[PDB]
Design a binder for this molecule. Structure first.
Ligand code: CHL
Ligand code: CLA
Ligand code: CLA
Ligand code: CLA
Ligand code: CLA
Ligand code: CLA
Ligand code: CLA
Ligand SMILES: CCCCCCCCCCCCCCCC(=O)OC[C@H](COP(=O)(O)OC[C@@H](O)CO)OC(=O)CCCCCCCCCCCCCCC
Ligand SMILES: CC1=C[C@H](O)CC(C)(C)[C@H]1/C=C/C(C)=C/C=C/C(C)=C/C=C/C=C(C)/C=C/C=C(C)/C=C/C1=C(C)C[C@H](O)CC1(C)C
Ligand SMILES: CC1=C[C@H](O)CC(C)(C)[C@H]1/C=C/C(C)=C/C=C/C(C)=C/C=C/C=C(C)/C=C/C=C(C)/C=C/C1=C(C)C[C@H](O)CC1(C)C
Ligand SMILES: CC1=C[C@H](O)CC(C)(C)[C@H]1/C=C/C(C)=C/C=C/C(C)=C/C=C/C=C(C)/C=C/C=C(C)/C=C/C1=C(C)C[C@H](O)CC1(C)C
Ligand SMILES: NCC(=O)NCC(=O)O
Lengths: 41, 192, 165, 99, 73, 219, 192
């Protein structure tokens, strides 16, 4: 699975998974914390 | 030298043999010899003018003739200025003309001389000759008193720009309650 | 009132905008039965809109001529009037997070530059090394300031290519 | 507004006097250091501009300090500008003060 | 016999400590010999002045019954 | 190198040898890879730990004394406002400026000691008091006028033991002050009040019931 | 030497031939010879002024003229100071100016001499000439009386910061009721 994990470590797979997890994290942030116009603490 | 301003630091090498040298040039403004020279005459001249100015500011308050701020006010919107409460017959334009002529003459004769004589000219400027007997320490006194007087004049200007009182009345107000009248209490210095 | 602006808690046009949005959503409501899935979706949308407007009125935003929140992008003008969360606090947040990402990428570049094949390591990313450097990049400001004071953050101009003028 | 004759005459005489006795050495030093306007090395005259030749009515003067007619006219012009400035600013009777 | 030699003014505008290198050493001949340098300076200044003219005549209308003619402005 | 570590199984980083007091090999972010930056961070750790120890003492001892009917000291979070309402209270800005001026004078000297460890000891600095700033060769451990009782200056390893005790106490008090800040930010009660509430019902009274730690939006 | 401060201790080498030396320097402030040389003169000067101050406060209280704290209180409130019932028509500004001038002259003409001469002079300051003929034990007596006087003066300051009464009045109250009238009983010294 060394070659398979090397394929998973290739630049397109890693950038698509990274933008996927970042977009999903931001989406769930807006799902639980919607309409956050300002950083009101 | 006698001094270090930052005791735990190394001072610039070009500030060692000069009088009143504490090695204070953290910005490196006088790394060149000509600039260091020009700064030296500028420092001594500013110190002398500031000593005269601070002496005048203190003396007009202690003799009771207003502060340093309302002194030119009688000459404006009317005329008839006062010195020691007396009378002078000169208005603003001719006073500026006479002062410009006198200062032009004095500073054109001073600035056309030797560089050492542009800051330390003996003879008629030392009538009793007390510069003899090692003038290094007395020069250190002169530049230090000048530095204190420049600080004092800047303080007069800034305090009047912030609080609007006279320097001696500001001093008395500070002595009234140093807890709650200092520079942190007005709305100007600290933006709170 | 920092620049002729009124708070949205007391500005009338903010309440008018909220009322108009809720009324439009109620006009959308008045077509389905009470317990249908579209009815629940519209009720959730209404609740979100009212919560958003009440939160904007609560947080102390400034409204202009009409009821739209305005942000202040001046330190001091936003600090002493309590609107540092408009621009200043998100400025600090972005600077921190962008520095984290950029420092992680930089350290990955300098880590794989001194390997056998730096060419291969940039299309075939060493995932454990990238994960470690992404974790280490959370202390990016202190590391960057330390490397700047050390002089190892920047490169001498005599070792950098330029054109022949 | 205090007599144009006295103000203009006194200011012109003063400008001439401080130009002849006070400001003459520094002006001479500046004129010596700056000297001719030079282009590509040589001056304008040496490059062919015959109109740029130093006029001969200023080169030699019987003044012991070399105060030429052009210096006299420049200093008189400066004095006239100062005199008319003070006359005009004393003619107006309005509150220009920031008080 | 009075006035300025602009070459010497450019020569004297050299700050110490090598802040600007040689300062303005020989910029007089650089501008004077090059028609393209002069044309670039002239076009830059004239374009900035044209922008100033645009920004000023709309906000400070100079001519009588201007800023009522909306098409003209 | 065989000293106990922050993870029995994870070897210490190569920039943490064991010489510094409290070196348990804990640096997962590798912030102290630069030696000079490591020295600066060691001095910062000493200063933060000492100030946190003083602050946590001044929080938990007066609060405990108030709990047992001695002195009656108000809450540490509102103690600034309690004094600020006094009839002879120094104004906040003026008091802050006085404190900052004194601390400027003191800690610029401390800073210059951080750079060169024998900085302030040169003759002619003060008015005869410069002899007390020789230092012990390590910045952050001045000695001289400080340490009057001379504790630990007898066997060298006695001072290293005290150094480790100091650094562990400082880290504990820093964590404690972070706890005080977070506990008062969530629950409007004192640290001893939070402790007493936790002993009443630990499964009910904690950080999962304040409503501020875990956000209500998720649950 | 006479004494060792603690009964059993290691003694500093630089505190043996000094008069009234007990080896009391746990901070090591006088490790440098120059530091000790300056601090010796500082201690002598402090002891002399403390003796003068203690004599002044005791003589102003037991002679029944007023309290030492209330001495500059009538200096404002209009004016007119008190000294043996004298009117003394000197205001606050001139009094401070004269005192500053006198102190500046005396201290400038004082501390420009030799290190032994700055602290231990002769001439008109010992007219009866009894510094000669064993001066070490007399110096020891001077230092010990000075230390006692510094303790007395700081005690007066702390006592008036505490209870706020007179020195001799507090002594009389302590002698009258030694139970509830001590330093411990007021709520400023012992909080527990
Ligand atoms: C050594 C310093 C010293 C200082 C700073 C003062 C300062 C003062 N004492 Mg004095 N005293 C001092 C020593 C002594 N006093 C006294 C005995 C008194 C009395 C009895 C009184 C004062 C009072 C006063 C006050 C009046 C001003 C004054 O003395 O004018 C300067 C002094 C003079 C012009 C006279 C100098 C005489 C000298 C040359 C011989 C003043 C705050 C008066 C006061 O305010 O009481 C409430 C007062 O009534 N003092 C004695 C004798 C034990 C002293 C020392 O031995
Ligand atoms: C650079 C321009 C820019 C900026 C400054 C913003 C800023 C903002 N947008 Mg916006 N947006 C933009 C471009 C921009 N947007 C573009 C181009 C689009 C079209 C795709 C959108 C579409 C859009 C929508 C649909 C919405 C926003 C929303 C928001 C707000 C939500 C803040 C938040 O997410 O909470 C805080 C987020 C965090 C604390 C996470 C930070 C840490 C993460 C995990 C790090 C990520 C690593 C990379 C915020 C003020 C939302 C809103 O409600 O507006 C008020 C929303 O609904 N934006
Ligand atoms: C750089 C120094 C300097 C400058 C620019 C000024 C400037 C000024 N002073 Mg001042 N003064 C100075 C130093 C200075 N003084 C010093 C060192 C003292 C002694 C402490 C005084 C004492 C003083 C007093 C008492 C008064 C002024 C006044 C004035 C103002 C009116 C000027 C005037 O009519 O005097 C005229 C100048 C002359 C007649 C020539 C100088 C006379 C000789 C050289 C001195 C011998 C007498 C003016 C703004 C007056 C004022 O406040 O206006 C209301 C005023 O009452 N000055
Ligand atoms: C027409 C009369 C006259 C003449 C011919 C001169 C001539 C001269 N003055 Mg002088 N001066 C005059 C009037 C005159 N002064 C008056 C009325 C005053 C007030 C009492 C001064 C106060 C004064 C001082 C304090 C100094 C001189 C100096 C000099 C010499 C240096 C050349 C120079 O000025 O640099 C070039 C000329 C200029 C740059 C013109 C600008 C003038 C402005 C006001 C100076 C800018 C500084 C500004 C106030 C502060 C900087 C910003 C700061 C807030 C950060 C020169 C020979 C300097 C010296 O001794 O040699 C170094 C010096 O330090 N003068
Ligand atoms: C990005 C550039 C920038 C700009 C254009 C401004 C502009 C402004 N600032 Mg500001 N400021 C800035 C950066 C900037 N700031 C930064 C980076 C900080 C953090 C150190 C501050 C901290 C700050 C404070 C604390 C205050 C201002 C204030 C002000 C306003 C009044 C300034 C004044 O009185 O005259 C000009 C001042 C000169 C010295 C010239 C003004 C509109 C004041 C304010 O809030 O207005 C009411 C105020 O007190 N600023
Ligand atoms: C992490 C890598 C990295 C870093 C540290 C930088 C840093 C910098 N860039 Mg650059 N850049 C990058 C990647 C990076 N860039 C890539 C991939 C591209 C191609 C799209 C560019 C294209 C680019 C241009 C055209 C310019 C810069 C410029 C700059 C400088 C201005 C600041 C800035 O943020 O500009 C903006 C940076 C961007 C718009 C690109 C950001 C793209 C992503 C977010 C970075 C890559 C993330 C990386 C994969 C993370 C790896 C994690 C690791 C653990 C594996 C700055 C020093 C400007 C400059 O020269 O300033 C003087 C400039 O003109 N960059
Ligand atoms: C070729 C150029 C030129 C020359 C050589 C003169 C020369 C003279 N002008 Mg004149 N002037 C000129 C151009 C010139 N002006 C121009 C262009 C204007 C228009 C702005 C004037 C307006 C003008 C006015 C209004 C006056 C003069 C006066 C004078 C005389 C004053 C000299 C004096 O010592 O008074 C005396 C010196 C003291 C009393 C001291 C003088 C002979 C003044 C005059 O008539 O003399 C009384 C006078 O009132 N001029
Ligand atoms: C800096 C000193 C500024 C404090 C001025 C206090 C003004 C009133 C106090 C006030 O306005 O309320 C507190 C204010 C922010 O609170 P908010 O007003 O946003 O709270 C209301 C909403 O957030 C909740 O609905 O905090 C600040 O002042 C700025 C934050 C410090 C910035 C941190 C950055 C550190 C780097
Ligand atoms: C050294 C250095 C170096 C490094 O590296 C950097 C840094 C830090 C930057 C630095 C520092 C600097 C500084 C501090 C400066 C300042 C100065 C001054 C203040 C001056 C003044 C100066 C000042 C001055 C002269 C003044 C003078 C005055 C006067 C005359 C007055 C007059 C008067 C009088 C009598 C009164 C009346 O009624 C009015 C009048 C008429 C008005
Ligand atoms: C090691 C490491 C390394 C790796 O690599 C990475 C990582 C992970 C990042 C790391 C970690 C870190 C950490 C943990 C940190 C923390 C810190 C702190 C907490 C501090 C504090 C610190 C703290 C402090 C100073 C504090 C202090 C305090 C005080 C003074 C107080 C005061 C007070 C009092 C008395 C009372 C009153 O009434 C009030 C007040 C006024 C308020
Ligand atoms: C040696 C050492 C070394 C080691 O190593 C460490 C240690 C421990 C630190 C040390 C110790 C130290 C100490 C103890 C110190 C102290 C001092 C003092 C007490 C001073 C006072 C001091 C004190 C003093 C001068 C005082 C003075 C006083 C006076 C003038 C008074 C005056 C007066 C009088 C007559 C009365 C009136 O009605 C008021 C008056 C006018 C006000
Ligand atoms: N050269 C005079 C001196 O060293 N004075 C020190 C002091 O004030 O005791």
């Amino acid at each position: 699975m060394k070659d398979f994990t090397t394929y998973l470590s290739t630049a397109p797979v890693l950038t698509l998974l990274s933008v996927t997890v970042v977009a999903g994290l931001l989406i769930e942030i807006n799902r639980f914390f919607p309409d956050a116009l300002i950083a009101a603490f | 030298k006698a001094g270090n301003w930052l005791p735990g630091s190394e001072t610039p090498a070009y500030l060692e043999n000069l009088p009143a040298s504490y090695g204070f040039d953290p910005l490196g403004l006088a790394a060149e010899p000509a600039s260091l020279a020009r700064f030296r005459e500028s420092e001594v001249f500013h110190g002398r003018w500031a000593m005269l100015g601070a002496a005048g500011v203190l003396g007009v308050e202690v003799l009771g003739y207003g502060n340093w701020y309302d002194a030119p006010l009688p000459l404006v919107q009317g005329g008839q200025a006062t010195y020691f409460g007396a009378s002078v017959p000169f208005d603003l334009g001719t006073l500026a003309a006479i002062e410009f002529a006198a200062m032009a003459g004095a500073e054109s004769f001073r600035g056309a001389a030797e560089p050492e004589k542009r800051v330390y000219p003996g003879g008629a400027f030392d009538p009793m000759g007390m510069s003899k007997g090692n003038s290094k320490e007395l020069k250190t006194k002169e530049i230090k008193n000048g530095r204190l007087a420049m600080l004092a004049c800047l303080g007069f200007a800034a305090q009047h720009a912030a609080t609007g009182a006279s320097p001696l009345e500001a001093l008395a107000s500070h002595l009234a309650n140093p807890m709650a009248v200092n520079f942190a209490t007005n709305g100007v210095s600290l933006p709170l | 009132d920092v620049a002729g602006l009124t708070p949205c808690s007391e500005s009338k046009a903010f309440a008018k905008r909220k009322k108009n949005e809720v009324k439009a959503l109620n006009k959308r409501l008045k077509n389905y039965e009470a317990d249908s899935a579209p009815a629940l979706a519209l009720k959730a949308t209404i609740a979100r809109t009212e919560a958003r407007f009440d939160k904007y009125a609560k947080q102390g935003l400034l409204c202009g001529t009409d009821g739209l929140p305005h942000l202040i992008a001046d330190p001091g003008l936003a600090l002493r009037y309590g609107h540092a969360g408009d621009v200043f606090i998100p400025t600090i947040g972005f600077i921190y997070f962008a520095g984290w990402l950029g420092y992680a990428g930089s350290k990955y570049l300098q880590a794989v530059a001194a390997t056998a094949k730096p060419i291969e390591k940039e299309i075939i990313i060493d995932v454990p090394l990238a994960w470690k450097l992404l974790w280490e990049g959370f202390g990016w400001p202190l590391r960057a300031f330390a490397e700047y004071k050390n002089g190892s953050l920047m490169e001498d101009d005599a070792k950098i290519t330029v054109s022949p003028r | 507004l205090a007599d144009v004759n006295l103000v203009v005459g006194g200011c012109t005489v003063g400008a001439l006097a401080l130009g002849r006795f006070v400001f003459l050495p520094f002006h001479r030093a500046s004129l010596a250091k700056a000297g001719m306007p030079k282009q590509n090395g040589m001056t304008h005259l040496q490059a062919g501009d015959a109109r740029a030749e130093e006029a001969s009515f200023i080169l030699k003067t019987n003044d012991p300090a070399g105060f030429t007619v052009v210096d006299v006219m420049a200093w008189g012009a400066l004095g006239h500008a100062a005199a008319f400035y003070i006359l005009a600013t004393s003619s107006l009777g309005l509150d220009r003060n920031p008080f | 016999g009075i006035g300025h030699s602009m070459r010497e003014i450019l020569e004297a505008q050299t700050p110490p400590s090598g802040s600007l290198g040689a300062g303005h050493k020989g910029l007089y001949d650089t501008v004077n010999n090059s028609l393209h340098f002069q044309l670039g300076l002239a076009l830059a200044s004239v374009g900035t002045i044209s922008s100033l003219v645009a920004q000023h005549m709309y906000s400070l209308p100079p001519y009588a019954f201007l800023a009522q003619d909306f098409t003209t402005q | 190198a065989t000293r106990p570590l922050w993870q029995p199984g994870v070897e210490a980083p190569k920039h943490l040898d064991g010489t510094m007091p409290g070196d348990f090999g804990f640096d997962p972010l590798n912030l102290g890879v630069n030696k000079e930056a490591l020295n600066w961070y060691r001095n910062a750790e000493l200063q933060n730990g000492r100030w946190a120890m003083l602050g946590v003492a001044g929080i938990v001892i007066p609060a405990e004394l108030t709990r047992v009917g001695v002195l009656n000291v108000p809450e540490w979070a509102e103690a600034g406002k309690v004094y600020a309402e006094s009839e002879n209270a120094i104004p906040f800005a003026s008091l802050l400026m006085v404190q900052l001026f004194l601390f400027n004078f003191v800690e610029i000297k401390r800073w210059e000691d951080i750079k060169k460890p024998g900085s302030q000891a040169e003759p002619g600095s003060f008015l005869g008091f410069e002899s007390g700033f020789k230092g012990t060769g390590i910045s952050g451990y001045p000695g001289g006028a400080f340490n009057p009782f001379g504790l630990g200056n007898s066997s060298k390893e006695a001072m290293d033991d005290l150094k480790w005790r100091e650094i562990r106490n400082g880290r504990l008090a820093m964590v404690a002050f972070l706890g005080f800040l977070s506990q008062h930010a969530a629950t409007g009660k004192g640290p001893l009040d939070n402790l007493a509430d936790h002993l009443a019902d630990p499964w009910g009274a904690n950080f999962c019931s304040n409503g501020v730690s875990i956000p209500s939006a998720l649950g």
